[PDB]
Assembly symmetry: C4
Homo-oligomer: 390 residues x 4
């Protein structure tokens, strides 16, 4: 049979370059003959043989007649869908995996693990599916909108880890991690440390011994909760990133939250999922992060890097590495994933570029993708090309 | 070569949860650019590597111009179609298997057996197809609308069983079972017991020794004929379920048919196919059934359970386990199937949710699917989302 | 590697039954959202693992804007296309094999051999393609519309035979057979006997030693030239079928051509391709043929059978076996093919049912398919369901 | 694992014949229900098991609403797309490989190498992708529109070569070759000889020891730079073809550039990519080339041949072999590729036939394909069939 997947060293490179864009709505004109699915929270996850593009469709297409509701996040119609990376996510092209208004997915080397969450707000449920079969579920512990990553889970030697979180969007949401194995949950991991609010974690393997995440704190701070999970002892701790280059939105001027690394600063009520990914080298660790270009709105998107250091205690601003999206273009949830190449892993960052033209029309997303390629500086940005009045 | 499929123990779980919905007509607006096939009597059947979604299309799509006739059940255009479970059943996406206005299908571990029925009413024919080849047929014994399950046939060690029935919808219809093997019929099984009317059987393996079914009796009773087929001796007997929780539609108040289990009660002319499925445990048997929420109309749908007991003689009402569809939504034929997971079977229930807006427009169905997942109570219901005036 | 295909004994059965219909234009309304390709001369050919549906598209779809010319047979746009048997032949679904306005195809057990003919009328060319590669060609010997079978070629032990014909539609057209092998022609076979006009041969294996065909004679007779090709010595002879049940169209009353079997009778200028297929049994040969129901027009279609006998010398009318299409429905070119089942061959007959509504609109075809299944009599006919004004 | 691909001897044949046409816009009427992608610079590349059709889409379909810009060559929306040879390149059918406004691709026997170029004009970048992973990049050396072949790269024993060029379209553009291996560049090859302007090289293997190309010189001459690359020593030299049959466009009367082979003649500002391909025989080399029929405009297309000889020093006009496209039809970029057959290579020529109706509407291309087949003379030409006002 095949073998279990493990993280290898990253492929050599030093900069990130535009790689692909998936703009389904370039094909959704009334005069056109297509039907791209209406989606949001897209993410990409790969296996040894291929990468797939996931999303949560609102079960409607463009052009269509079910646009009311597309702008909201939860309902009985939402489904986690997927197409192979490179295909346009359309009605026929897409494969519906399960009903869900929050989700994750990851390949363990053998089959795919799809995660989905749905049910009432006051009592939602995390559904786990192994390939073709529905394998397990997990209930609401804090009874306020159980939810998940919205990016890929990470599997090592057959065990996949996954952050889940229950709680108020504007208050307390203590997250927990799940060690799933072959569809079945085999251990819950209660994180230690600064746990008042951690949601939408973007996780990855810094090594075979540790998974790390840059998450969202939706109520108390503009800084980002940074999880470090020890896979050896299935223990996890959280502390705020110390860097002055605050990675959340909305947020204030860099390095303006006075105090120790642990200082929240003003609430800056709100947040956004942020891409983060590791570039493991033999004797160094490259950590890459994205941030919107606007301090206040979800416009534009920049890439940062900081080799080595403890995110928990280093105040130093991250190194700017390029503008993937400009302030004139939409920059929403961003995430990281890794393409598996013959001998090494290629770290990447996908950016959900949302089309939003009010709540009186359709609402959907495009997916831009930057990956580590050779050297130099990042050279070009991404535009969607989509005109919403077509 | 591959091996023959057998029933294993069910995967551990205790409750059923919403898993997936397939609502093709969410994409059939005049302003949209899709073409979901117009169908009815959908069912799902799986193999070791995948599940497929079957149905009987009226050979027309939405939007289209051949809506007259869609509301009727038999004609020279109807075809048994299929897509992989998760794909939207559209003109291009679908694969046409054979001409048929009644059907079944099941995978034996090696290839697929598709069943289809067509021909004149007074002399229809059961056509059997092994994979790509047309292998055998079976004629009308009672010369009044020969018909079949409308859900999956069950194969064990290479032999597939299938209930067929000939007779008046409003009178006598004695069913027979067929032991097919590799496309060819190798034995007819004449059932013993209460055989005055048994149609649309929903069958499954309670064990390696016995197949069991909950069928429809269209003329004499609101109770359901319950078939028990001994695979060792290819013998089958039928008796009415004794439970007070009558599973058919239309039907009267529970436990109001006075008399022994064998008492029909008032005719309650009409019926409906009902989902039923087994949850085999090492030392126990879990039997699950669906019933519409309305006593009189095909609106809503509830899940029931009763571990162990003889359905033939136990008066006890079944245990309610959840509302999969509410009385505001359509609840028509329901069925059960089992997903094959690496080491166990995952029992499930699909519900055909029909869009019916008169006989002066299109008529088609959506497919909701609940499967056994973890614990707790069933949490959420299914809606179709479809507006028929689009 | 795989092995070479050979003819085996037919699967046991005694009658033919409706199996499938492919009516693409049921989905070509202006209000619909599909694009079935506009085609003609469809045929079906199988391999050990699957059957494919071939045709010659006019490189335009319905609804579309290139209907002028669809009614004619030859031009620089026509292409031989194919979809797997069961899929609707649409723009995206179809695979374009080569440019051709006449064609054939057959699987040798290993790869597919596609044949196509195109070029000027006074000097056309037979193009042979082995799988993905263009392998050989063959030129016009009589310089008047080189053309081919329009149904499957037959391969035995790696050698495929194929009838080609050059000459006037209203005069002399001596056909020749080609023994192709792995894409390359390795021998021409000049037929002996009654060679004044033989076109559109429908061929098959009566055994491992002989291929036989029922062809069209377009100028001199209503009877059908019957080719017998000895695969041992690659020699072929032709004589007219002696039967009174004349199988061509137009034609006069059965048994009314007075004289020996070799008597042509009145010209009955015109012809039509006719389905023919073998049902080889251990000690008997079943030969099946189709004929339109109307003596003069291409309306309706009937099945005939005659076990054993020499088609060359038996005057006996064939045995009627059923009406596959009624006189109210279109019955054009018909053909025979054989599905390969695990241990035997299943003979079949496809009927091209043409939609013709003048030369001032689209012109295309549907494909009905009857195969040998069990016993009894053929029970039901085929209708297209297509309304041309939609 | 599989083996590395090498060039074998060509399949025997002597002439070229029309093989296939891909005219997506035959299906892009407003009244039709399709969506062929709007593209340009199409090319075809094969592997041991299949050929794929590549192109640079303008990320818009017909009919659609994003036609402005389609006529230009560079922007942030352009993507290198592909479908299997024979499929119509449509939104759903196509697979998007990467963002790029110039590209190449080739199969090494194991996986596919896709090449793409994008970024600012004054500093573009060559992106290399190995199968699913982004593997390497290469920067602008002359800072003026880095660009690539626009036809297939050639791989031998695991090493793929690829011409890249940087410089002014109307001045100096010295090209370089890249020896890529498994996604990673492992050597740059600076060509010796007449290097003032060489772009859009159409390359192939004349043998295992040498790759050869017919390229474009956009500013100085109507003659074509002819590259000869020694794979043994990874060295390359360039000189102008000496033949009087000038293969570029615009160009003057044949044999009218007076002087040695090295004489440029008048600038004839402009150029066009031209198909070229080798027909390697045991003891001879057949070189085939295409040229537009019009000396000044990109209308029509003719095939030429010249067995043996040094293109660098032979003045002899090439031998005309046929008109693939007439002067009434569009003849733009042409290229050569080779289908891999069981035991030999089948050389071919694809012709990009562009639909151009001003800059106030859509702009796209069709792909005609001639391959070496049997003997005789080329018999028939290609038309597109497309009416731009539909
Ligand atoms: C489950 C859910 O509501 N997912 C979301 C999706 C989008 C957005 C969003 O920020 O647009 C927010 C949420 N919720 C949280 N808590 N971030
Ligand atoms: C063959 C056939 O008529 N199938 C049906 C389909 C639907 C329905 C139905 O209840 O909607 C009924 C039938 N017939 C029976 N006897 N139940
Ligand atoms: C090559 C070609 O013309 N094929 C045809 C197709 C249809 C028809 C037809 O009968 O409709 C006729 C022909 N020609 C001949 N000779 N039968
Ligand atoms: C990169 C780029 O501009 N590619 C082109 C495409 C088409 C055309 C063309 O000739 O239509 C020209 C170019 N550029 C050059 N230098 N030939
Ligand atoms: C983890 O272990 C496997 C080899 O056992 C391999 O993926 C890799 O060397 C290790 N991970 C890293 C980042 O080195
Ligand atoms: C039936 O037999 C096979 C093993 O021979 C296996 O599927 C299973 O153990 C048996 N079925 C059940 C329900 O135990
Ligand atoms: C032809 O030969 C092979 C076995 O060698 C097999 O297909 C079959 O027995 C023979 N054909 C017939 C019709 O018997
Ligand atoms: C190149 O080498 C391989 C055999 O090693 C084979 O492709 C061929 O014989 C050689 N190429 C040519 C053109 O002969
Ligand atoms: Ca925050
Ligand atoms: Ca489609
Ligand atoms: Ca009843
Ligand atoms: Ca005739
Ligand atoms: Ca030039």
């Amino acid at each position: 049979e095949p073998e279990w997947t493990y993280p290898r060293l990253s492929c050599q490179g030093s900069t990130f370059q535009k790689a692909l864009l998936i703009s389904p709505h370039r094909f959704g004109e009334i005069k056109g003959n297509s039907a791209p699915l209406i989606i949001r929270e897209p993410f990409v996850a790969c296996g040894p043989k291929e990468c797939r593009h996931f999303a949560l469709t609102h079960y409607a297409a463009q052009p269509g007649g079910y646009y009311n509701g597309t702008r909201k996040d939860r309902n009985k119609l939402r489904h986690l869908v997927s197409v192979k990376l490179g295909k346009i996510p359309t009605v026929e092209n897409s494969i519906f995996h399960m009903a869900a208004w929050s989700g994750s997915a990851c390949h363990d080397g053998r089959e795919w693990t799809y995660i989905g969450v749905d049910g009432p707000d006051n009592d939602a449920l995390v559904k786990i599916k192994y390939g073709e079969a529905y394998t397990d579920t997990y209930h609401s512990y804090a009874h306020n909108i159980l939810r998940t990553q919205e990016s890929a889970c990470n599997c090592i030697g057959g065990d996949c880890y996954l952050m889940i979180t229950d709680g108020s969007a504007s208050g307390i949401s203590k997250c927990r991690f799940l060690k799933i194995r072959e569809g079945r949950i085999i251990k819950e991991i209660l994180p230690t440390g600064r746990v008042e609010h951690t949601e939408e974690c973007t996780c990855g393997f810094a090594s075979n011994k540790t998974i790390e995440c840059a998450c969202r704190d939706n109520s108390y701070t503009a800084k980002r909760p940074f999880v470090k999970l020890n896979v050896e002892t299935d223990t996890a701790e959280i502390r705020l990133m110390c860097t002055k280059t605050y990675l959340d939105t909305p947020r204030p001027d860099d390095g303006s939250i006075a105090g120790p690394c642990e200082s929240n600063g003003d609430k800056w009520l709100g947040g956004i999922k942020g891409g983060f990914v590791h570039q493991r080298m033999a004797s160094k660790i490259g950590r890459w992060y994205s941030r919107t270009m606007s301090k206040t709105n979800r416009m534009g998107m920049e890439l940062y890097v900081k080799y080595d250091g403890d995110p928990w205690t280093d105040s130093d601003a991250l190194t700017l590495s390029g503008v993937m999206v400009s302030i004139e273009e939409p920059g929403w949830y961003s995430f990281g994933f890794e393409i598996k190449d013959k001998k090494c892993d290629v770290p990447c960052i996908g950016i959900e570029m949302v089309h939003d033209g009010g709540k009186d029309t359709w609402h959907s997303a495009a997916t831009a993708i930057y990956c580590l390629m050779g050297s130099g500086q990042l050279l070009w940005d991404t535009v969607t090309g989509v005109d919403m009045a077509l």
